[PDB]
Symmetry: D3
Subunit: 59 residues, 6 copies
């Protein structure tokens, strides 16, 4: 499985490493897929690049 996770910028490397680990494990348990087959891409978003209800996250 291949997961792409869009998150807001600002997390530490350590936090993102945890995210990759926990999500990968979750995918593995859910689908009975071998952990080694799971790939995760983290894509960071700047605050001014993410909109909710037409408004900036930065705001």
């Amino acid at each position: 499985p291949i997961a792409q996770i869009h998150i807001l910028e600002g997390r530490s490397d350590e936090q993102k490493e945890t995210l990759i680990r926990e999500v990968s494990e979750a995918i593995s348990r859910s689908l009975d897929a071998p952990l080694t087959s799971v790939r995760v891409i983290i894509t960071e978003m700047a605050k001014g690049h993410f909109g909710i209800g037409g408004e900036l996250a930065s705001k």
Copy 2:
């Protein structure tokens, strides 16, 4: 957080529901993000639409 998960076709609805819940919880706990802010998209791939090493995963 918005996660898109590409998986091969063949899983049950029950499995996919579990995937959504477990992944959402993992994201929420890892990032200290509100659970309701987490969105998950499951994208199924037909076997003939996924390649590894230039060959079909068939």
Copy 3:
């Protein structure tokens, strides 16, 4: 500009046509980008494939 829009299944073809036109106009006007250069991809999600708060939408 290239837009991919994930939406729940269930809309008519005409509704999706309107979506493409209106989003394309918005992108062109906002960025002063040539309208003819704007590409929009509609990706439909089955209800059992979209989660909000860990629950099916």
Copy 4:
């Protein structure tokens, strides 16, 4: 609805804010989905990372 928009780098924060607002409203009215449910991600592309016809947008 969730929209991801790939655009070339170079726009101001203000332009991108306008983009997010206008695209979100366009999605909302076209699909009659509540505006507050609409998420928009802006993904900026470097000039050297976007190809048309096998040629860089840089040229």
Copy 5:
């Protein structure tokens, strides 16, 4: 490397197999990447789901 290719519906399985092979080789050779590390996802678009210049 991971490539996702959006294409209009209508191509044969044979064409899509060729697409995966040729794109994977192009990525591998261009980036000096191990061929087995290359993944390609084909995503088909219905004609009514793809807009250029605001028109279908």
Copy 6:
């Protein structure tokens, strides 16, 4: 056709230009799509942003 290619950061501009050209040509000939219609997006990943088996790929 529209291709998005996720690759690890570290390549030169020249390498990425070659990638775009060769991938665009491969798409064109494989699908018999006019080359001028082919668009390619390169998306670079930092090493700390890519996981295999729950571990950073690095």
